[PDB]
């Protein structure tokens with residue numbers, strides 16, 4: 001019950017690492033806004049799991065990286081917080097949603113560079129900007145990056161550019177928000193099982209597994225357990241940091 | 253009670269961050285070996301705090317940085333674990349102890365013998381402690397090296413000390429890879445300026461200058477660092493290895 005009476009928004013928590021994160025924040029007593037783009041069935045399943053486990057959650061639909069995205073998300077978020085608490089306080093923001101076998105550098109288009117940046121860097125910035133209006137002293141901003149910002153993979157150049165921009169939001173906003181006691185940190189996963197069809201193919205899972213020093217792919221919960229710790233009071237002396245949650249991928 | 257049934261060694265836990273760390277590991281249920289070099293009263297005060305908070309601990313005396321240091325520490329550690337548990341299993345090693353001089357030493361004044369003493373205690377001893385500790389450590393164990401933000405922040409009067417924390421961080425990198433097949437994680441936690449109870453922290457003028465290094469404009473409390481070390485010692489940190497964990501209160505924002 002480390003997060004009793006707190007309110008959290010996990011972007012992209014219908015599926016994958018965001019679902020695992022929403023589930024773990026709710027187990028600690030947070031009221032969780034489960035945000036999704038279009039998969040309402042998956043959002044409703046995250047909420048149902050949280051409720052079955054004795055916590056509280058509600059879904060929020062908003063496609064990010066289009067005109068009106070932040071306003072749409074905050075309309076749903078504040079309505080659901082106000083109905084359940086009488087307040088619109090936001091304690092915890094997890095910028096988890098993203099666009100993700102990559103694109104060879106020669107094949108990347110301007111349209112692809114714009115979509116990746118819209119969703120993966122621009123929307124996170126604008127969500128931080130809006131979220132702090134509601135955020136009390138002692139709040140938490142957690143940006144989900146990627147170990148690819150430290151590990152060269154040409155076919156992930158477009159994606160990795162956006163995660164490099166995301167990490168700058170961590171650096172510069174940690175300094176900006178320090179006076180308010182709001183921390184801002186990056187958590188960087190390695191290859192992580194998000195329930196994608198590729199994780200049902202043992203051959204490919206075994207090749208992907210070799211990337212980790214533990215010679216297994218990450219589970220969504222392995223990353224979500226680290227996010228959950230950063231969301232708690234005991235992380236208060238960590239800000240502006242790169243938190244490696246990759247199972248030793250950057251060791252080689 | 254995340255560490256029920258676990259045994260931990262915190263080097264240099266008579267005082268400062270190591271005291272705070274031993275106290276927090278014991279509150280999670282670990283049996284804690286409270287290691288010190290010379291200040292037996294301070295070690296006994298760490299133990300007494302753990303015992304009154306309902307935990308279990310015992311002191312282990314061993315000067316590090318001298319012949320026989322690892323042997324001496326492991327004789328005391330194994331005797332105390334065996335008496336209390338019937339086993340010598342070491343789940344958690346925190347390499348916290350260090351030669352750590354508030355005064356510092358400007359480069360012109362550093363001696364060959366100061367370079368030796370800092371390296372012996374701060375880099376050599378941690379290396380040899382890891383080598384010995386893993387014999388006793390199960391799959392799922394934890395090695396936590398206490399570094400310093402000075403590996404990323406230039407401070408000429410701490411050059412000799414910072415050399416040794418650069419060497420300590422290499423223990424983290426290379427040993428994380430070596431030990432991953434056994435499921436043992438190895439991580440650096442880097443404090444910034446942290447109140448360790450030393451006389452400098454009783455001088456508000458100086459505390460106010462020191463405070464400016466943190467983005468939060470306060471010095472760290474020993475518990476602010478200890479809370480992070482305690483998390484790394486738990487099961488929920490399993491997917492973190494080989495890492496530099498910044499526990500500096502935003503000192504490294506450049």
Ligand SMILES: NC(=O)c1ccc[n+]([C@@H]2O[C@H](COP(=O)([O-])OP(=O)(O)OC[C@H]3O[C@@H](n4cnc5c(N)ncnc54)[C@H](OP(=O)(O)O)[C@@H]3O)[C@@H](O)[C@H]2O)c1
Pocket residue numbers: 011012013014015016017018035036037038039040042062063064065095096097098099100119144145146147188189190191192193194
């Ligand atoms: N190996 C990995 O899985 C891996 C590795 C490194 C980093 N990461 C990072 O970890 C985070 C989670 O990854 P994941 O693998 O769990 O993702 P995922 O399984 O692809 O799930 C993506 C989530 O984000 C939402 N989302 C996607 N695009 C959106 C948009 N334009 N607007 C709004 N919401 C949108 C999805 O909503 P719908 O359900 O409605 O589609 C879903 O909830 C991302 O930041 C990713 O870059 C993942």
Ligand SMILES: NC(=O)c1ccc[n+]([C@@H]2O[C@H](COP(=O)([O-])OP(=O)(O)OC[C@H]3O[C@@H](n4cnc5c(N)ncnc54)[C@H](OP(=O)(O)O)[C@@H]3O)[C@@H](O)[C@H]2O)c1
Pocket residue numbers: 263264265266267268269270287288289290291292294314315316317347348349350351352373398399400401442443444445446447448
């Ligand atoms: N600002 C800070 O406080 C700060 C900043 C960055 C990093 N650190 C790091 O955090 C750790 C703890 O620092 P602290 O400030 O809490 O230290 P401290 O208050 O100076 O306490 C040092 C501890 O190490 C033990 N120790 C010293 N020399 C030893 C030796 N040769 N053999 C064995 N034990 C020895 C001491 O034992 P006795 O009590 O017996 O003397 C004591 O328990 C160190 O690794 C330090 O480098 C501290």
Ligand SMILES: COc1cccc2c1C(=O)c1c(O)cc3c(c1C2=O)C(=O)C[C@](C)(O)C3
Pocket residue numbers: 100101102146147148151153156189190191211246249250
């Ligand atoms: C350290 O992080 C990695 C190391 C080796 C390979 C990969 C990664 C990734 O972090 C990573 C990622 O963040 C996201 C994706 C990948 C990787 C990755 O290889 C992909 O393959 C394609 C996917 C699943 O569509 C998106």
Ligand SMILES: COc1cccc2c1C(=O)c1c(O)cc3c(c1C2=O)C(=O)C[C@](C)(O)C3
Pocket residue numbers: 352353354355356399400401402405407410443444445465500503
């Ligand atoms: C980020 O780490 C710092 C940033 C600014 C100033 C200091 C530090 C330290 O980490 C640090 C340290 O590791 C150890 C000491 C110092 C510092 C430090 O400034 C000292 O001043 C003297 C002391 C407390 O005996 C040894």
